[PDB]
Amino acid sequence: MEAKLSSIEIPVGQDELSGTLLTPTGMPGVLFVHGWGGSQHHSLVRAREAVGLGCICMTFDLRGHEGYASMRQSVTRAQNLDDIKAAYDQLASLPYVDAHSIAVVGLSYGGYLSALLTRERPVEWLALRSPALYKDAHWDQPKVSLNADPDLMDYRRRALAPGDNLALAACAQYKGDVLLVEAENDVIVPHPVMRNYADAFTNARSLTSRVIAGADHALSVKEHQQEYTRALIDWLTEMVVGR
């Protein structure tokens, strides 16, 4: 772990002593991207535990949510991807964070967009929980319009190669380490989406994959909600401990 030496002046009487403050720097940074209908607050318990590992963390409200709940029906994936890029840039650009060591931790919609993020920004470690899949068609349409299409159900129950889908393509290019967490009984992002993701990541340094037994997409049982916290934190510990 690295230190920053900052010269300082210590007053004592008519005089001032010279000194050095050593503080942490070049720390790994973790970015949490929430799913649709979520908020910056769902991740704080995990963000906290990550700070425990010696990280700097950031959560934020995607547009179309919270302070921009007003955009729920108009916001495009284009715009939400711009949000993730903005958060990323602000986290990477902090002096005490090492831009070469950013983890992104994305959920459902957030997970999809995070997958995409990696083709445009450096992500050392990528952790996806129940990432959504959508058709490449209609990038600049309202994201709610994507779930309007009843055929979405079928699409997430189909087999899909990297060639069929921009997110899956991004994974095929992805070279970092990957954590894939799924909810055994998810009916929103069911196993076949996961199967497609796992299959597409055949260039990552590593691919870890936890399934939470009997969970649903919300991880609505407390114990599942905590299995995931433990899964994520064990992985970050292993990933970030390594360095």
Selected binder of its own copies within 50, 104, 146, 189 (CB under 8 A) = 50
Do the strands 27-33 and 97-107 form a parallel or antiparallel pair, or are they unpaired? parallel
Residue type, position 58, single letter: M
For position 216 contacting Cl ion by CB under 5 A, the verdict is yes
Residue 149 contact among Cl ion, its own copies, none, beta carbon within 5 to 8 Å by kind: none
Residues paired with residue 183 on neighbouring β-strands, in sequence order:
212
Number of residues forming the site for its own copies (CB under 8 A): 46
For position 24 contacting its own copies by CB under 8 A, the verdict is yes
98: left (phi over 0), alpha (psi -120 to 50) or beta: beta
For position 37 contacting its own copies by CB under 8 A, the verdict is no
| Residue 217 CA to its chain's centroid (Å) | 16
Which of the stretches 51-59, 184-192, 197-205, 216-224 binds its own copies when contact is defined by CB under 8 A?
A: 51-59
For position 83 contacting its own copies by CB under 8 A, the verdict is yes
Give the whole-angstrom CA distance, residue 50 versus residue 237.
Answer: 8
Residues paired with residue 128 on neighbouring β-strands, in sequence order:
106, 180
Do the strands 15-25 and 27-33 form a parallel or antiparallel pair, or are they unpaired? unpaired
Catalog residues that contact its own copies under the rule CB under 8 A: 1-3, 5, 8, 10-13, 15, 17-24, 40, 44, 47-48, 50-52, 54, 56-63, 66-68, 79, 82-83, 85-87, 90-91, 96
